[model samples]
Target: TDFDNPRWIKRHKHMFDFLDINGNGKITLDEIVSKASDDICAKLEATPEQTKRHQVCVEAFFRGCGMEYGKEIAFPQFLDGWKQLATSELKKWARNEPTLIREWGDAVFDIFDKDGSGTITLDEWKAYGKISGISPSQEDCEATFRHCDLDDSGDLDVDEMTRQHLGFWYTLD
Candidate 1:
């Protein structure tokens, strides 16, 4: 019943493909870790410490999605994870686990905050779309930016980005 909505299932399928990274039809923990480290961290030229922190955040994010070590995730398990995340218990966990979410947000914000301006501008968001394997269209990036631009300042700060990320996983819709 949780995944009864066609739109939700389709959206999660898109997310699954994005996370698969190598067209492998499955998501492995190492792929998620290295994608953050090699793809995003390396692209941003993050420092050793920053890379380590990003890796930790990436691991936590993956585990928070109901993943485990020494296992690969198929679509069914991924769907179950999303369902679990929508539950009250996991929603409460997301609300209470600020440290993990904030760290993940900080790392991702650093990626799009190229000028170190403490916010992500539209241009930066577009750039991220281009650099990320997802390769979202400009319109899609703009739409996502608008969605996350909570104050309509045409930019997203760490808090806004963090909240959006939480909504992405925890919200039913």
Candidate 2:
């Protein structure tokens, strides 16, 4: 319901996957509002004072989707309701073959570009995870870095980071 567009019906499943913070089979209301209190704030760049209100707003959104507070819904059920709101921009990136390129490409770059050097290395990736409040393992960081480093450049610029962001955002794995 956030973007509220209709042509990207295929992207709902991908968005659901990101909403499942625990990598579990279902998405809990708690997860959607706070992502289990992990990176939701970081992802939204929310201040402490704004978090509670944001959570309430997000919960109200889920309620409108037929999900009650404190309940968990199967991925399929979640997808069913999410389908109607999927948008063209989302689907375009969802179908895109690259990992880190997108219309929101620059925002992604600013989120992970730790050194202000215009590229992301493994260290910065880890820093990003930490700042984002997600505790990614060293191995996870390296693997992601390698996967998105296209061209074996050992660094990720806007294009590379966009693809990786898309990969993470779109791929259920």
Candidate 3:
């Protein structure tokens, strides 16, 4: 019941905002998988196979957050689930689980690597923000890009993205 950690709360809230694309106070699997899948597929002109793969990855991520397919998640439930993941043994699994990271990393990387360049540039990250309904400010996008672009490469490869993805969701620090 004590969700008082600022960084933890902010990170989970940011994800919830992205998932609740309609600015609604609740999140559904359809919003996360159906809508986002279609939009990202259209934006990337993804193949049927690629689209299916993306859908699976998104659904897996949603379910992994302890969400059910038919139910809508209110903010408190979503936050509590994430808090449990971060504080429980699942945190270790999330951080070190290679296959989970690989699937999610590849799916998200496929979305933002718009030019098939195998890396995501700042421009590509901005496009992702637009596609994902976050529509974050230019500065926010830049900061995220910089944070994830470890090695000072000015671009994000799958490994950097995967690490940051886990860190964002599961890391306490």
lDDT of 1 by residue, 97-124 (tens): 5555566777777656767588777776
Q: Compare the candidates by TM-score and give the number of the best one.
A: 1
Once fitted onto the true fold, the runs of candidate 1 whose alpha carbons sit more than 4 angstroms away are 1-5, 21-24, 88-99, 111-117, 121-127, 130-148, 152-154, 163-167, 171-173
Kindly report which residue pairs in candidate 2 clash with one another: 99-162, 99-163, 99-164, 100-161, 100-162, 100-163, 100-164, 101-162, 101-163
Tens-place lDDT per residue, model 3, 64-85, is: 7678777888988877675564
- lDDT of all predictions, in order shown? 0.68, 0.58, 0.69
Q: Candidate 1: global Cα-lDDT?
A: 0.68
Worst 10 residues of 2 by lDDT: 98-107
Ranking by TM-score: 1, 3, 2
> Which structure is stronger by lDDT: 1 or 2?
1
**What residue pairs clash in candidate 1, if any at all?**
none
**Cα misplacement distance, residue 61 of candidate 3 (Å):** 1.5
